[PDB]
Amino acid sequence: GTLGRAFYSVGFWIRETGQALDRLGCRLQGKNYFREQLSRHRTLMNVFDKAPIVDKEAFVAPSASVIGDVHIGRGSSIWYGCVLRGDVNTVSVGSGTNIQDNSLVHVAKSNLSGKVHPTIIGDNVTIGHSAVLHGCTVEDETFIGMGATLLDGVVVEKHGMVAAGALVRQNTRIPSGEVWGGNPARFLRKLTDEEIAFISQSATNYSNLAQAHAAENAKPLNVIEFEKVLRK
Amino acid sequence: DVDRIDKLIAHGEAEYNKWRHPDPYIVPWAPGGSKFCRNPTPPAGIEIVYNYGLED
Ligand SMILES: CCCCCC(=O)OC[C@H](COP(=O)(O)OC[C@H](N)C(=O)O)OC(=O)CCCCC
């Protein structure tokens, strides 16, 4: 509670005092390598008492910025450029789903707009590229189109495939096995069975591909490039 | 004739206004009666909000 934040602030104070002592010692020796412009990014950024919990079998890209109370399930992939932010409430990411390139998830930061709704993601949810889910719950086994603009309060239930470029209005549920697209999300047709199988097929292939990357993206730092950067 | 009506209407109005019965009859629910706006029908469209003055 409040007491923990006081100890956190005192921790900052003592940490900065020690850091300044370190800088004085380094600078007294005639070294100024603390003035570099190294990118101070963490792929698992947190706040005082959120500390995002990620499953060990999941894969998170280095460019991903998981912030807040984001929970990641088993086998799900967190691709490059996604901006999953979960400070205000929980952001549950299902098991076996995937969050593609240049996507994100809000929690609707400002509390002025009514009550903040936590984001829930179901299992095997093939979230599309450039998805901007604005704090909406999404049930399992569904597909989200590229460039979708899901807003808060939306309940996309099972098999509710959402067309590309959709702008589904807030608090408007998508019927099961029904596609909604356009500006705004309007009924187009009913979901077919081959696409029903294709959703799970794509989820499985993306999970396997993410496993392959995690196998190859955890390679040691290859100090050859480290020497290349320094020697210039 | 139009010249023989204005004088007649003026005379009639003046004579009529001379006796008025200071307490004329007005229906009680009429505009001026003894129960005008007794228990009027409530206004058509008005709503009352409940949660006002809350925070966050
Ligand atoms: C015990 C800690 C001593 C650490 C001494 C120290 O770090 O001096 C730096 C600071 C400000 O100097 P800079 O702006 O160059 O900080 C440059 C950059 N922030 C850096 O750290 O080098 O000095 C003071 O204000 C303190 C005045 C009173 C000092 C008693």
Query: Which CATH number do you get for residue A87?
Result: 2.160.10.10
Two tokens at B31? 């505009």
Q: Which residue from A23, A27, A32, A36 has its CB within 8 A of the most atoms of ligand 1, so it is best to mutate?
A: A23
d(CA B44, CA B28): 24
**How many domains does chain A contain in total?**
1
Residue that has been written with the tokens 């370190």 in this structure: A22
The answer to whether residue A72 sits within a structural domain is: yes
Contact residues for A156 (Cβ-Cβ < 8 A; gap 6+): A136, A137, A138, A139, A142, A144, A150, A162, A168, A173, A174
Q: Is residue A21 part of a domain?
A: no
Q: Please calculate the CA angle A154-A157-A160 and round it to the nearest 5 degrees.
A: 100
**Ligand 1 binding site (Cβ under 6 Å of any ligand atom):** A 20-21, 23-24, 27
Give the span between the Cα atoms of A78 and A220, in whole angstroms: 20
What is the helix (H) or strand (E) element at residue A69, kind and residue range? strand A67-72
- Map tokens 């569904």 to a residue: A142
Query: Which numbered atom of ligand 1 lies nearest the CA of A27?
Result: 22
Which residue's CA is the nearest one to ligand 1's atom 19?
Answer: A20
Pairwise CA distance, residues A135 & A91, whole Å: 8
Give, as one character, the DSSP assignment of residue B43: P
Dihedral (Cα; A119, A122, A123, A128), 10-degree rounding: -70
Q: Is A163 exposed, middle or buried (0-12, 13-18, 19+ CB in 10 A)?
A: buried
Does residue A101 have a known ligand-binding role?
yes
Experimental method: cryo-EM
What is the Cα–Cα distance from A86 to A69, expressed in whole angstroms? 5
Please check whether residue A174 lies inside any domain of the structure: yes
Is A98 labelled a binding residue?
no
Tokens of B49: 């909000």
**Residue range of the domain that includes A89:** 53-218
